[PDB]
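CORE FACILITY INTAKE
Project code: CF-77B
Contact: R.S. (postdoc)
Sample description: multi-component assembly, five entities in total
Requested service: structural model of the whole complex
Turnaround: standard
Below are the sequence entries exactly as provided by the requester. Do not edit them.
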Amino acid sequence: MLRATVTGNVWSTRRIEGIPAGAFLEVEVEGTGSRMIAFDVLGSGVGEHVLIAQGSVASSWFTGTPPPIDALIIGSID
Amino acid sequence: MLRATVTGNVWSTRRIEGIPAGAFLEVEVEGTGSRMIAFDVLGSGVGEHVLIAQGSVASSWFTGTPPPIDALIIGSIDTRSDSNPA
Amino acid sequence: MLRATVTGNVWSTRRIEGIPAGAFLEVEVEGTGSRMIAFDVLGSGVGEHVLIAQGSVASSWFTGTPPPIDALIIGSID
Amino acid sequence: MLRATVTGNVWSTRRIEGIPAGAFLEVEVEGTGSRMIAFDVLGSGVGEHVLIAQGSVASSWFTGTPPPIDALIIGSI
Amino acid sequence: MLRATVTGNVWSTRRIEGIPAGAFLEVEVEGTGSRMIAFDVLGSGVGEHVLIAQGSVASSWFTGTPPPIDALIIGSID
């Protein structure tokens, strides 16, 4: 998993079917400054420090048909 | 997921069986400049900014036999999307 | 798998459902100095040398519903 | 997926059970020059430009028990 | 998959449950010189050239409960 900071909001209106309710957030990984887009269900805001999981476990967390999501914010960091 | 820009189309001369309808697009990852080939079912265009998912979740989106695809464009990026350094 | 050293830990109070009992530990990969957060169930202490597995095998190790975990400390290195 | 060029053949005589029929090919990823070994079922030759998929999708392409393969040549370019 | 050379043995003082019979070997990836730890069931020795598979296919090869293994030596290279 990675520590990251939420750095922005991504909207994708023309998108494939099968994405659940939630938000696409830009995050910046701590120390490296690498960026990625992570899916969020907790309601995380810009500036928040978050913990991210990657790969198929981000998709398999969801009920219903597993979504084409490979990065999920799994918690907020205190 | 990654933001990328479509830079071109990849023309195959032959393929293994089991690849769905759709296109192989060359994309350039925003910020790193890294290139990869992503599968596209949306009719994405050259120059378009897109969102990509990687790994087995790209294949599992498809119905039927799991295709041998490890990168999928899942949408285009709206112009209101924003970014800022941490 | 990678050799890593435990360097710290993460507290997360607001989390998605499905994180198992255990701790989020910060580890540094030996030789590279790259850092990540790995889940710990053994009781690895700060400074300890550990072995890490990554990706979905970190989640599927927990039997039952897959936790949204992509890095697991699987042992202490002698 | 990645663009790569086949640079040679890899022979492995001592193997764990479950490798499918086919060949191990060394490839070089375009632009980065990174090398890896990919599995091939099409009969790709040295010098050929190919498209590679990585991770478990290389394995799950095969029907039946999952082979312990994490890179597959899925086409020629 | 990766071409690598076995560079040594890795011993665990304490490990989680569910790891099959076999050895943890340190290997050096040939193109890069990068090192990693791979699981071995073939009885590979130091100095041997081996072929490695990474990720969930390293675990799903095994019978029984999914082992927490993300790198497996699948063969020796001639």
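Facility notes:
- The CA atoms of residues 30 and 54 of chain B lie 15 Å apart.
- The radius of gyration of chain B is 13 Å.
Invoice: internal transfer
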